[PDB]
Amino acid sequence: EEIGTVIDAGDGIAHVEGLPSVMTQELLEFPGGVLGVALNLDEHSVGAVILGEFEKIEEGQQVKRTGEVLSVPVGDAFLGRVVNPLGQPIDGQGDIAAETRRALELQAPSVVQRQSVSEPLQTGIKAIDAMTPIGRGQRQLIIGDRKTGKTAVCVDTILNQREAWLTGDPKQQVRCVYVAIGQKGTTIASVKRALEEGGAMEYTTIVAAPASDAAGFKWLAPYTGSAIGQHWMYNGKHVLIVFDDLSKQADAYRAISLLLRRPPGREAFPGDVFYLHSRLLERCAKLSDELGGGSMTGLPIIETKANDISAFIPTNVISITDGQCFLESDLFNQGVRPAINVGVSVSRVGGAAQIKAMKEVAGSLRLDLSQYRELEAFAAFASDLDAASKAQLDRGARLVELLKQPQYSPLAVEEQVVAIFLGTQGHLDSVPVEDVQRFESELLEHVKASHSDIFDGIRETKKLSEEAEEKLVSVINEFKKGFQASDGSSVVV
């Protein structure tokens, strides 16, 4: 048995002389049930990061090595539970039955162990599902300034997974993991409450690293969530992991590194911060059929400052991920909500992550929106604009009004298909802009009320058939006859 002695300690770090056989990243037991991680190894001592209650660390204390690298419990029992980066519950609901344990640094699937992303992950947000589709096994960044609706988007996705969960088929169910790094505890409580109101905690786990936690927990929380998701991914299940947000993890890791006297680089970050995030985010894969066919979809969040996407961590994460959703406060204040900037947001997976009906209906949306952005400047001179460009500006305005969405209201894929069908087939041209949204919602209700066969066809076949299209157009015309505008005018013809 090897026992080390604490030779110094300060602001979360402790140096321990001894333990000549200690491994890098090994967990260490300090008195009083304190836990540390051996990060710096040299001939003189071992610089370890204390995971909590650092004030209890004193010089001369006896430190024992666990003989094991950082590992977390994993199992189905974690669904609906709130745990800390060590897998311990912090919601006061008793112990968690752990199926097994996973090391936090197990290597990601290799190039040969993956398959191309081909399954949609419906976020329930028309803008994302139509313009920047997310497939299962993809890493989609959600990047924007504070108070732009990033957490809203992620929570809406988690809520949207509820119908798939209720189907009961493991090939459709999505297990959700939410990692909160450096967030106010009451904010995590609010997020949990929002998920509970939508019946999402039945299939969601929260890895909580509140702002009061040691920098070690803020540094490890994404990896704990990743391991929990990996345990399900490797067993044939599909997972969706949200990191809120990687910028705070990078800041915590920078604090740890600086306190360890490691050489700083740009923005004082160490030389392996990009390695930190790439290692975290390359574990979200789409496994091959030989490995069960499971997958984990990553939804990292990045909080920029002054909409500066050229900063260090935003640049790294943008490089790493397969696509980006840029949220702008200017659009948010304009009323565009979710405030996704369709001009710059991109999904490199593309149509491969969409069902056939969504791909067909959304094909023209990109062109129409780009053309609308081009024509914006001429809204004051409709007379000067020719007929084509005038109707084109009007169609763009209707479409922009269509992609708006109230919070905590995800849409099923068939409903999104019908809405975008209204938008891109001229069925909103006869409606006032201010009414479009309302019209949309009402029409959808009507289709649910009496014509659910359209939704059933779209859902089961994934294609809007010709006869289904004709029936949808007929229902649209009847609703237009029955629809009442806010200005009191008519929308027929």
Partner: protein, 89 residues
């Protein structure tokens, strides 16, 4: 502060550019069919084309200045960080 002011000036110049281009196109249409005329009082299509070109040049210059300031800020920040680290070395 200079970087923020440069970014604000860049967005201002961009808005000026789009409005001037729209005015130029509308003037072209009206020709085919206020004082923004270039030197008629001392034509509006010519003035708006000139204004849009000047806005393009101003935007390019402001972007060059903003990129220079961005690089300078990064370099100075790293200079301070490394100076502190060396002092503590």
């Amino acid at each position: 502060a200079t970087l923020r002011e440069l970014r604000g000036r860049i967005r201002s110049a961009g808005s000026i550019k789009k409005i001037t281009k729209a005015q130029e196109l509308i003037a072209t249409s009206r020709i085919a069919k206020r004082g923004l005329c270039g030197a008629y009082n001392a034509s509006r299509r010519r003035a708006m084309k000139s204004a849009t070109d000047n806005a393009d040049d101003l935007i390019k210059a402001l972007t060059l200045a903003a990129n220079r300031e961005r690089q300078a800020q990064i370099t100075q920040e790293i200079s301070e960080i490394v100076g502190g680290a060396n002092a503590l070395a």
